[PDB]
């Protein structure tokens, strides 16, 4: 959960279009591919941070949903390296294999 | 069409270092050189018209060279070509792009173009196109 301040009443709010990766459903794996899509931690290489736009009376407010990889990229920058306790918290949040 | 067919025999693979690209599947400077080596400046002019968008001012210099009786640029363009070649083409990765300039601009008599001229007729033909008879003192003696 997160909040942010917005200048002026939200005259509009939208996503921007999804890139989706085609599921290569063949005569072999057709019973073995989920009809549903995988969660972002599974697709955060092939798919960018999911893009959004809000409009107020002041203009556009452009932003993205951050992936676990963009959250890691933020922590590697906030700790200025590959170590620091926030990266050691990220490994305890996602678990060591997914981190 | 003869020269483009001869290139399927003497260049059966693309050489890494040739410049300014291709026409019909064959390198522009090789197509120009072997059309000139078989005397057909009209066949060479077809390549120079086909590849105009890469060749630029070389089309205008080739058309100056085509409209004198004696295969000559004016001293007001031959020495442009000498001042271009000595800055951009002497130490180039395309030896056809060297040889065609060494001919048309009568320059680097000190180079035999031997990455193109393997033989005594091609040595004679190269140096005979490089001949002057004329005491134009604007020419430096190292090109003369």
């Amino acid at each position: 959960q997160m909040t942010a301040g917005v200048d002026g009443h939200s005259w509009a709010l939208s996503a921007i279009d999804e890139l989706k990766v085609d599921k290569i459903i063949t005569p072999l794996n057709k019973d073995h591919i989920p009809i549903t899509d995988s969660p972002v931690v599974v697709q955060q290489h092939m798919l960018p941070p999911k893009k959004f736009v809000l409009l107020s009376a002041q203009g556009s407010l452009m932003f993205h949903k951050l992936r676990p990889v963009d959250q890691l990229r933020h922590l590697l920058v906030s700790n200025v390296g590959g170590d620091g306790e926030e990266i050691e918290r990220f490994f305890k949040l996602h678990q060591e294999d997914q981190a | 069409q003869l020269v483009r067919s001869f290139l399927n025999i003497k260049l059966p693979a693309p050489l890494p270092g040739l410049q300014d690209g291709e026409v019909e599947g064959h390198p522009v400077w090789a197509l120009i050189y072997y059309c000139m080596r078989c005397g057909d400046l009209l066949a060479a002019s077809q390549v120079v018209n086909r590849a105009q968008h890469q060749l630029g001012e070389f089309k205008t210099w080739f058309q100056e060279y085509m409209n004198s009786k004696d295969r000559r640029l004016s001293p007001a363009t031959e020495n442009k070509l000498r001042l271009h070649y000595r800055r951009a083409l002497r130490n180039n990765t395309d030896p056809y792009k060297r040889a065609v300039y060494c001919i048309i601009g009568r320059c680097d008599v000190t180079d035999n173009q031997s990455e193109v001229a393997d033989k005594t007729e091609d040595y004679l033909w190269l140096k005979l196109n490089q001949v002057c008879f004329d005491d134009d003192g604007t020419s430096s003696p190292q090109d003369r």
């Binding site: 005569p27 072999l28 794996n29 | 059966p12 693979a13 693309p14």
Partner: protein
């Protein structure tokens, strides 16, 4: 990717039909872990398009090596060049040119001679009357089987 770029459906139609149906039932992990004959036959079909439709194999033989960090993908490409020159020698009518391209085809087989079907190559030399390469390659195919005496 290279098979997609060289118009795929052509190269797959050159295959033996037993492989054309195997290609539909092998999974990517079978093709990566277990197979060798579908991948070798797809390379051989890509090269047979070049040899039949008369591009020079040298450029595709080199592209097949950049895409490999270090692997076998070399002696099949040399054998393919040796074969390109041999199949061109059959159409070539200048005798000088035919003996030249045979004294080039021979030098490609003389690299890889431990791994050559010498029966087929020396029968394919008989089919061009190149008995010279039948003496030479058959010695270069004994010489390297016993390099110790």
């Amino acid at each position: 990717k290279l098979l997609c770029e060289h118009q795929f459906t052509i190269i797959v139609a050159e295959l033996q039909k037993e492989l054309q149906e195997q290609l539909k039932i092998t999974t990517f992990k079978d093709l990566v872990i277990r197979d060798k004959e579908l991948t070798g036959a797809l390379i051989a079909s890509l090269i047979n398009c070049y040899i039949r439709d008369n591009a020079a194999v040298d450029g595709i033989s080199l592209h097949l090596q950049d895409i490999c960090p270090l692997l076998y993908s070399t002696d099949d490409a040399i054998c393919s060049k040796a074969n390109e020159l041999l199949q061109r020698s059959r159409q070539v009518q200048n005798k000088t040119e035919k003996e030249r391209m045979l004294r080039e085809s021979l030098k490609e087989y003389q690299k890889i001679s431990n791994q050559v079907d010498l029966s087929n190559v020396c029968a394919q030399y008989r089919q061009v009357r190149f008995y010279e390469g039948v003496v030479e390659l058959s010695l270069t195919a004994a010489e390297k089987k016993d390099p110790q005496g």
